Ligand binder design. Structure first.
Ligand SMILES: [Mg+2]
Ligand SMILES: [Mg+2]
Ligand SMILES: [Mg+2]
Ligand SMILES: [Mg+2]
Lengths: 102, 67, 118, 233, 57
RNA sequence: CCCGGUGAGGCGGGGGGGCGAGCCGGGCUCUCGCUUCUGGCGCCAAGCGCCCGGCCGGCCGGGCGCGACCCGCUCCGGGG
RNA sequence: CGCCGUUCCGAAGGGACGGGCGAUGGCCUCCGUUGCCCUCAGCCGAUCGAAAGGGAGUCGGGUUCAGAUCCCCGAAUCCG
């Protein structure tokens, strides 16, 4: 016999993901001192459609606690969050929709 | 005649002393690259009876091969 | 004294310039694209004559490796004239043709007689 | 007189607030692989169980004994290349118109001298690597009754013999004026090393957990002790 | 104009005579001055009560 | 030995300070480490202490420390 | 022979306004250049990949047997 279609999927080739127009990987913040002890504030800049994904993605912006920079995070958009909203991530963030807590 | 004691010592590979040295050295050798220039022979007596001489032009290389 | 950065980077170390004990080549190689090499011979076709008479232009076959700056400097030195610009094409047979235009104070028709073209 | 314009502008370094200062991150640096390797090897020698044959070398002379031992040895350094030429030339003129005592260097030369009982004092560097070169010498010297000591630094014994490094040196003879100094050093060295040999060779090393682990165990017990102490109050 | 054509234009053609001019609209520049001022005032209001409450405490 | 994260950025222990508890003003039980209203701003030190230099006590110009606690052996976690 | 792999087990920067020490020079006046030191420094991936994608800036008239937005005449423009 010959190799069946299921076998051929694992070799990549014409069976790889179509990631040309995706907006990046949707992740939480990288845990640091701020989230280990207190909280950090962030503002929701945009909610965007991600090709190939049913859920929208939120583009949250934080202040870098060690440098003069803005960090852009690509979160999964919890239902009910809006642009211009403040979200807070950390151990002492308050139990509100869109906040990131342990 | 230290090369005589070392030779006998490296025959007791299951002794507590040599087991400790082989174990930590294997660990250290495992954190390096599969080919690595060694500054000097780890076994000066074994090296020399295989022809090694402690003079310029002789070099040592440690090679890691999968078992 | 202290490290304000969690990164470790290779420190900059002195880099000496080369000081060879001997030169690898005993003598420099002679220039093989001098002025006499660049200009092979002048073109004498019907259209080259038109260039001389109407456009104050000399037409030369030149080394394919030569560039416009080289052609211009070679033309001036060989025939002691001034050059306004140079246009170049590579012919279908592989030769490079140079359309050299002379300064207005020069007469290509006169210069051609000096060269022997006319 | 103080300018009224000048003022304090303190920075608040709480979570949020102002950017953090450029403090010392030495502890959290990502070091090159070779640095991580030699440091993790020093932690293993503490963490693991080091046999007494290898661990005997952690016991060494104090600075004050090593200074005396090194000052006496400084008086018997082998003649350098330059000053041997002078000695040879001085012999040439001597021809036309004894061997003083000197240190014996090298694990191979010292081993033969110890076996022959021709050595009076053996000094062994503590950081020989591979350790197998000298891991047997303390036991050998003890068998032959040759007093031995362990000194900090194969490089210090290196400077004695005008070489980068030296595993071990041995006193074979001393001048009459220096016989008393050797007798004093031998006595102190003999008690610490040759006389305690029975306990030295049973004394394992290492087997010490890291500070965070030790604190974690100490805290866990202190809860029991305080709970035990609160049991009766 | 195209982005590389801005290189040969003078500055006056590329901005406006105002803070953030040529990068932020006037409408939102008015809003940041008010927000920056109004938010800074609330800090003093909060701070005074904190000290005043602490003063009693 | 393995896995995850990070530009390996504050880990462990102790010190020091604030809110409560409580025995007869001090010690402890023991907690906290200064950001939640607004679609702003936020680095490249203020201040203080101590030394040094240039010019004629006055002008000019630097260094160190605190500010920014101390000591530690695995970067931090999760497995093992 | 090589293959996998493309940031993943890497000491991956040969740079910069400024400042300090010398060595040299020139419209030697004072300004350059250079070497070292101090200080500062994310980009985190060598390189290749489109004559239809991105990509500053040329148009009119004349001219040949055969070429012209390329030659000549005239009038412009970008970049350095
Ligand atoms: Mg290319
Ligand atoms: Mg193209
Ligand atoms: Mg194109
Ligand atoms: Mg033109």
């Amino acid at each position: 016999g010959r190799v069946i279609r299921g076998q051929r999927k694992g070799a990549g080739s014409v069976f790889r993901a179509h990631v040309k127009h995706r907006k990046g990987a949707a992740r939480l913040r990288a845990v640091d001192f701020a989230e280990r002890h207190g909280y950090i504030k962030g503002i929701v800049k945009d909610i965007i459609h991600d090709p190939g994904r049913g859920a929208p993605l939120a583009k949250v912006v934080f202040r870098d606690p060690y440098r003069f920079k803005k960090r852009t995070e690509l979160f999964i958009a919890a239902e009910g969050i809006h642009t211009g909203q403040f979200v807070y991530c950390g151990k002492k963030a308050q139990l509100n929709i869109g906040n990131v807590l342990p | 005649g230290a090369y005589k004691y070392i030779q006998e010592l490296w025959r007791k590979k299951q002794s507590d002393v040599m087991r400790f040295l082989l174990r930590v050295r294997c660990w250290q050798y495992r954190q390096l690259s599969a080919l690595h220039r060694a500054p000097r022979p780890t076994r000066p007596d074994k090296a020399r009876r295989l022809g090694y001489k402690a003079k310029q032009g002789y070099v040592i290389y440690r090679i890691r091969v999968r078992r | 004294k202290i490290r304000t950065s969690p990164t470790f980077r290779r420190p900059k170390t002195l880099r000496l310039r080369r000081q060879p004990k001997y030169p690898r080549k005993s003598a420099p190689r002679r220039n093989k694209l001098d002025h006499y090499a660049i200009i092979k011979f002048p073109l004498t076709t019907e259209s080259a004559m038109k260039k001389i008479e109407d456009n104050n232009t000399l037409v030369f076959i030149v080394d394919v490796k030569a560039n416009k700056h080289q052609i211009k400097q070679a033309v001036k030195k060989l025939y002691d004239i001034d050059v306004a610009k140079v246009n170049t094409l590579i012919r279908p047979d592989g030769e490079k043709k140079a359309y050299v235009r002379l300064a207005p104070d020069y007469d290509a028709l006169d210069v051609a007689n000096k060269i022997g073209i006319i | 007189v103080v300018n009224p314009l000048f003022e304090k502008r303190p920075k608040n370094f709480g979570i949020g607030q102002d950017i953090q200062p450029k403090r010392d991150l030495t502890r959290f640096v990502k070091w090159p692989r070779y640095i991580r390797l030699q440091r993790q090897r020093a932690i293993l020698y503490k963490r693991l169980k080091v046999p007494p044959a290898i661990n005997q070398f952690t016991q060494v002379l104090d600075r004050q004994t090593a200074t005396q031992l090194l000052k006496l040895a400084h008086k018997y350094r082998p003649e350098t290349k330059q000053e041997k030429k002078q000695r040879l030339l001085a012999r040439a003129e001597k021809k036309a118109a004894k061997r003083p005592p000197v240190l014996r260097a090298g694990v191979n030369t010292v081993t033969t001298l110890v076996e022959n009982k021709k050595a009076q004092l053996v000094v062994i560097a503590h950081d020989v690597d591979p350790i197998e070169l000298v891991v047997f010498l303390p036991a050998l010297c003890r068998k032959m009754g040759v007093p031995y000591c362990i000194l900090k630094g194969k490089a210090r014994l290196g400077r004695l013999v005008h070489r980068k490094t030296c595993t071990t040196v041995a006193f074979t003879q001393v001048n009459s004026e220096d016989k008393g100094a050797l007798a004093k050093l031998v006595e102190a060295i003999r008690t610490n090393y040759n006389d305690r040999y029975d306990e030295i060779r049973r004394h394992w090393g290492g087997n010490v957990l890291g500070p965070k682990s030790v604190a974690r165990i100490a805290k866990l017990e202190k809860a029991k002790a305080k709970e035990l102490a609160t049991k009766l109050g | 104009v195209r982005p590389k054509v801005l290189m040969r234009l003078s500055k006056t053609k590329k901005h406006v005579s105002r803070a953030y001019g040529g990068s932020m609209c006037a409408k939102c520049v008015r809003d940041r001055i008010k927000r920056a001022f109004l938010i800074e005032e609330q800090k003093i209001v909060v701070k005074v009560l904190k000290a005043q409450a602490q003063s009693q405490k």
